[PDB]
Amino acid sequence: AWVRQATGAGGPALLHGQRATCEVIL
Amino acid sequence: RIPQRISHAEALKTLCHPAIHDAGPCLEAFAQAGPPQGDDRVRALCRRE
């Protein structure tokens, strides 16, 4: 209940277009 | 192309206006929308004042 409250516990807002990302720990 | 400056003291007509410091409608807009539903917010609802 802290970690999801730390961050992030078809959205209405989009000016450009769809969006992607990913993560690799280096 | 004539150089034109703008700053605070030239904007001072609207900066020093009484309806700026009047947060009466800002009071009522803060009183309309209550506390959002966050785990931080429900806990931060406490007595101090």
Annotated resolution, angstroms:
5.0
B 1-49: CB under 8 A from A: 38-40
Give A21→chain B minimum CA distance, Å: 26
User: What separation in angstroms does the CA of A23 have from each of A5, A8, A9?
Assistant: 21, 17, 20
Query: Experimental method used, please?
Result: cryo-EM
User: What separation in angstroms does the CA of A7 have from each of A22, B14, B26?
Assistant: 17, 39, 29
Q: Which residues of A touch B37 (CB under 8 A)?
A: none
Structure tokens of A11? 């959205």
Q: Is A13 exposed, middle or buried (0-12, 13-18, 19+ CB in 10 A)?
A: exposed
